[PDB]
Amino acid sequence: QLCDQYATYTGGVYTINNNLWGKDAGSGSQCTTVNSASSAGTSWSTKWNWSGGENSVKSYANSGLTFNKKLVSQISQIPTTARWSYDNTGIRADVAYDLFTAADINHVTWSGDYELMIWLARYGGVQPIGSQIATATVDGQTWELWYGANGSQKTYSFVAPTPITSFQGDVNDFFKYLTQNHGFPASSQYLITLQFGTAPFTGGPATLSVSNWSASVQ
């Protein structure tokens, strides 16, 4: 039961972090519970109540994968499944994959030269960094594609037009899209991080239950 800002637990190839990186922007608390974490997947939940700092993310409690880092151009597949639900959707928050890449394979793993997000859900109109630049079709499904930047990190967010509580896909289809359509430098960027979780702004109490998350990088 993980309540502290960087409380964490690792089982198998999964690492679950409470990751209350934004806690000083508001008032409240958040605890993350690990149900299972094995070679094959992980199940966990996080319960939070946040107020204040309404335009600032308070946290990104998440499960992250331990994998062999490699150039995005050398990746064949990133198969993943995510099944989740929120008990309370009267909130301002999003549910998302978060991936970082860097030119340095030893970059710090909480940021990148690039970031790729895949938002399975958003509540209350909260939005990714930047602006919508395209509607992208990936594996036969449409995504709003956002692009933003903070002057070091450049972030592409693929946003689901409606909530996807049971997702199965290959994240490498998204990297391929970026490489082929947006000049993403796949041959000089290492994939360094692959996480799935939720980013709350305000609301609660609310509980994200992740009944299963799996991924691999081949």
Ligand SMILES: OC[C@H]1O[C@@H](O[C@H]2[C@H](O)[C@@H](O)[C@H](O)O[C@@H]2CO)[C@H](O)[C@@H](O)[C@@H]1O
């Ligand atoms: O700002 C540092 C903080 O970033 C977190 O990642 C952010 C990302 O920077 C942002 O572009 C995106 O919209 O949301 C993610 C998730 O909140 C990261 O999780 C932290 O560990 C890091 O301290």
